[PDB]
Design an enzyme around this catalytic site. Structure first.
Site, PDB file in Angstrom:
ATOM      1  N   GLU A 237       1.019  -1.731   0.146  1.00 59.43           N
ATOM      2  CA  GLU A 237      -0.506  -0.101   0.585  1.00 59.43           C
ATOM      3  C   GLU A 237       0.962   1.457  -0.115  1.00 59.43           C
ATOM      4  O   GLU A 237       0.624   2.180  -0.166  1.00 59.43           O
ATOM      5  CB  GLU A 237      -0.692  -0.132   1.011  1.00 59.43           C
TER       6      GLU A 237
ATOM      7  N   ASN B 227      -6.516 -20.939  -8.741  1.00 57.94           N
ATOM      8  CA  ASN B 227      -7.554 -20.352  -9.582  1.00 57.94           C
ATOM      9  C   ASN B 227      -7.779 -19.146  -9.446  1.00 57.94           C
ATOM     10  O   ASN B 227      -8.768 -18.458  -9.844  1.00 57.94           O
ATOM     11  CB  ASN B 227      -8.475 -21.364  -8.421  1.00 57.94           C
TER      12      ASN B 227
ATOM     13  N   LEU C 126      -8.905   4.544   2.637  1.00 56.83           N
ATOM     14  CA  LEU C 126      -9.797   4.756   1.179  1.00 56.83           C
ATOM     15  C   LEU C 126     -10.879   6.079   2.265  1.00 56.83           C
ATOM     16  O   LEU C 126     -11.330   5.957   3.040  1.00 56.83           O
ATOM     17  CB  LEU C 126     -11.161   4.272   0.436  1.00 56.83           C
TER      18      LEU C 126
ATOM     19  N   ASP D  62      -6.635   5.775  -5.500  1.00 56.62           N
ATOM     20  CA  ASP D  62      -6.905   4.040  -5.492  1.00 56.62           C
ATOM     21  C   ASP D  62      -6.469   3.723  -7.357  1.00 56.62           C
ATOM     22  O   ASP D  62      -6.336   4.546  -7.470  1.00 56.62           O
ATOM     23  CB  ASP D  62      -8.446   3.650  -4.839  1.00 56.62           C
TER      24      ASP D  62
ATOM     25  N   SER E 291     -12.212 -20.637  -4.678  1.00 53.40           N
ATOM     26  CA  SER E 291     -10.593 -20.821  -4.915  1.00 53.40           C
ATOM     27  C   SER E 291     -10.563 -20.422  -2.640  1.00 53.40           C
ATOM     28  O   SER E 291      -9.550 -20.501  -2.527  1.00 53.40           O
ATOM     29  CB  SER E 291     -10.467 -19.340  -4.877  1.00 53.40           C
TER      30      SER E 291
ATOM     31  N   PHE F 293      -9.057  -6.578   2.685  1.00 47.77           N
ATOM     32  CA  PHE F 293      -8.404  -4.767   3.233  1.00 47.77           C
ATOM     33  C   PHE F 293      -8.459  -5.247   0.960  1.00 47.77           C
ATOM     34  O   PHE F 293      -9.309  -3.791   1.865  1.00 47.77           O
ATOM     35  CB  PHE F 293      -6.739  -5.465   3.406  1.00 47.77           C
TER      36      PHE F 293
END
Length: 165
Positions: A11, A135, A32, A20, A120, A107
């Site tokens: 990040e 996958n 955000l 973003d 998955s 997250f």
């Protein structure tokens, strides 16, 4: 390594407002502020969270003030995971490292976002790393943010922090 450092890297730490991957007014470490294209809006939710946790906030923010938000965002993640049935069981069956790879996902795209990876998740519950890691390779997630996706998949597939050395 740990989930916090994992996201720090994935990040970055920016003290001024930024966009973003999708161009949403984000700040600090992936926090955000508002999906609205309004610049003043961001600063509104921003100032909102800052002088809360008589000053103001024009895009800029202070470290640890960003780490305060980061710390919650992350907890709020583990919370999202445990409050969701598709995710609580998976999360509970995973080791220290893989629990962090899921926390990361929730997250990035939120609880229900990572709850959508139904197949998955199965593969993951059955500890079918390689099969589950291939996958996950198919999804807008991987398509839109492959670099990020590559690291988290790797982490799921190996159970190590190799992608973050």
């Amino acid at each position: 390594m740990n989930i916090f450092e994992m996201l720090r890297i994935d990040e970055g730490l920016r003290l001024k407002i930024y966009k973003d991957t999708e161009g949403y007014y984000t700040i600090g470490i992936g926090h955000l502020l508002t999906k609205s294209p309004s610049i003043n809006a961001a600063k509104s939710e921003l100032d909102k969270a800052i002088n809360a946790a008589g000053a103001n906030t024009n895009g800029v923010i202070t470290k640890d003030e960003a780490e305060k938000l980061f710390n919650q965002d992350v907890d709020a993640a583990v919370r999202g995971i445990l409050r969701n049935a598709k995710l609580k069981p998976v999360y509970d069956s995973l080791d220290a490292v893989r629990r962090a790879a899921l926390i990361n996902m929730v997250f990035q795209m939120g609880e229900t976002g990572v709850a959508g990876f139904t197949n998955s998740l199965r593969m993951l519950q059955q500890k079918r790393w390689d099969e589950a890691a291939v996958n996950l390779a198919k999804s807008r997630w991987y398509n839109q943010t492959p670099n990020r996706a590559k690291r988290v998949i790797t982490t799921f597939r190996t159970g190590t922090w190799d992608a973050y050395k």
